[PDB]
């Protein structure tokens, strides 16, 4: 996925990564919904649900934590 550590739009406050959505697409199944490769040893085998998103094709975003912007008690450190 993107490699912005924690970045906004050029002038706006909207976080660039999620574009203000607050949610991104799963990076394991690529929005597919089912697992593709066996991952650990065989307890997560291909054909079943995705091991990460549990079958929702949509996860939260790290830089902007569910807040459509950068700053505040969710995305930044409290002083």
């Amino acid at each position: 996925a993107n490699n912005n550590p924690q970045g906004t739009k050029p002038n706006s406050l909207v976080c660039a990564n999620c574009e203000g959505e607050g949610c991104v697409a799963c990076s394991q199944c690529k929005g597919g919904g089912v697992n593709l490769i066996d991952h650990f040893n065989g307890q997560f085998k291909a054909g079943a649900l995705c091991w990460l998103c549990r079958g929702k094709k949509e996860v939260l975003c790290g830089d902007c934590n569910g807040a459509g912007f950068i700053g505040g008690f969710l995305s930044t450190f409290d002083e």
């Binding site: 406050l13 203000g20 959505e21 607050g22 569910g66 950068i70």
Partner: protein
């Protein structure tokens, strides 16, 4: 996020919404609309999205909505922002909850240089759940039986290093002369050189003597600010047992919980409460960061209090004088229309809640008597510092000087004369039948100017 969902510029606010007006200055690069939406989101659920709120379709019932971001003229890189909060976010009877919910963590936002809270509007639905002033204005003017003129008070300046015996003698001298109230210094509670029970005893003795001797009703503000709540209640109960009619408190160092507790006690036990405003310049002195004082005056009128310090306006330039007149009108009156020229941002209706009495102080003398008498009117108290204890003859002569000057000015205002132009003339034709007023007019040479 081209849609902001928090900046609804066409939203009109209800009559059960709490409105707030901020003046903010955004960082370089950030626009104004998004800064307003961010101020609305920080002081509520701190999200623009709906990834948590959409738990079971329980959305947007507990979020604020910016609806006006007009800019302020003169200054640039500085704007006004209006915000509307629902009513079911706040609890009843608690001012701490309102403060915590609004100004809790918005001031620590990172994408703004500075942020100030200028006004606030409480709906009637929320005004009716607080007690308010214990007594008010009409009741506290009927209890003391003093009609048709301001009240007179004196502060005792030789604060520290005075035995309780001498303290009582000075109080007796001042009160016997003709004053109404004496005031206890702000930082005299229980120091080792003068404990509080002794002070209370001798002050009560002096009050009883002077009141039984002069026929009027006298009083002394007794400072009950304590380290805990048990000590505060002990001091208040003892001051009531002696028969004292009025006490004192500090609502900004002791807090709002202690002030609400004391106000409820004072309502139940028939005592008047005078509120001193120490430690207030720490919050509101700079015009670019803090909490304007009219917001704290409103919060005080809500929680409790009968008198309130407000500061003189005899030498302010303009705007500041208009601002102080505005937030004096916000305290004494019952319905105030929006007039941005004198501070008031929103229309406030108090639903027949009693008023609060302004107090002027800070080194004023007899020559200021006309101006004050026509600015604050007759619903106020006038505190004198050196203007009473500095008379060449003593304390009782200074008391009589101030009393004579005040009654002369008010009698001259009643007849229809003008106090701006010919106030000094009135004082001069009054300072002929009395030596004390003549000595006072000769000591304070300040006849500065009028009109």
């Amino acid at each position: 996020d081209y849609k902001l969902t928090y900046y609804t510029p066409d939203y009109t606010p209800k009559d059960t919404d709490l409105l707030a007006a901020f003046r903010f200055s955004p960082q370089p690069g950030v626009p104004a609309d998004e800064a307003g939406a961010a101020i609305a989101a920080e002081s509520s659920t701190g999200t623009w999205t709906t990834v948590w709120t959409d738990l079971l379709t329980d959305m947007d019932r507990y979020k604020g909505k910016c609806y006006h971001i007009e800019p302020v003229q003169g200054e640039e890189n500085s704007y006004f922002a209006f915000i509307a909060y629902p009513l079911d976010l706040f609890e009843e009877g608690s001012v701490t909850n309102i403060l915590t919910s609004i100004v809790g963590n918005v001031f620590g936002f990172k994408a703004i240089r500075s942020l100030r809270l200028e006004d606030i509007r409480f709906p009637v639905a929320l005004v009716k759940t607080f007690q308010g002033p214990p007594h008010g204005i009409q009741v506290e003017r009927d209890l003391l039986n003093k009609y048709g003129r301001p009240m007179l008070g004196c502060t005792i300046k030789p604060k520290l290093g005075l035995s309780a015996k001498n303290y009582g003698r000075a109080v007796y001298e001042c009160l016997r002369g003709g004053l109404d109230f004496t005031k206890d210094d702000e930082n005299i509670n229980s120091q080792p050189f003068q404990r509080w029970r002794d002070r209370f005893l001798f002050v009560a003795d002096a009050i009883h003597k002077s009141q039984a001797e002069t026929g009027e009703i006298k009083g002394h503000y007794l400072n009950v600010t304590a380290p805990t709540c048990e000590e505060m209640m002990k001091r208040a109960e003892f001051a009531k047992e002696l028969g004292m009619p009025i006490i004192m408190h500090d609502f900004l160092t002791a807090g709002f919980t202690a002030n609400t507790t004391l106000a409820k006690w004072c309502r139940d036990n028939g005592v008047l409460l005078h509120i001193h405003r120490a430690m207030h310049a720490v919050i509101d002195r700079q015009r670019n960061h803090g909490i304007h004082f009219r917001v704290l005056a409103k919060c005080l009128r809500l929680s409790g209090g009968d008198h309130l310090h407000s500061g003189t306006v005899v030498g302010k330039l303009e705007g500041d004088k208009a601002s102080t007149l505005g937030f004096v009108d916000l305290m004494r009156e019952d319905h105030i229309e929006a007039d941005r020229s004198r501070g008031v941002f929103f229309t406030q209706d108090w639903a027949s809640m009693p008023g609060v009495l302004p107090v002027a102080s800070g080194g004023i003398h007899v020559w200021h008597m006309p101006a004050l008498v026509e600015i604050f009117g007759d619903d106020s108290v006038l505190q004198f510092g050196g203007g009473t204890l500095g008379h060449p003859w003593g304390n009782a002569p200074g008391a009589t000087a101030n009393r004579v000057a005040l009654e002369a000015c008010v009698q001259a205002r009643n007849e229809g004369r003008d106090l701006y132009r010919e106030g000094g003339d009135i004082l001069r034709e009054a300072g002929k039948w009395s030596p004390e007023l003549a000595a006072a007019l000769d000591l304070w040479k300040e006849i500065k100017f009028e009109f």
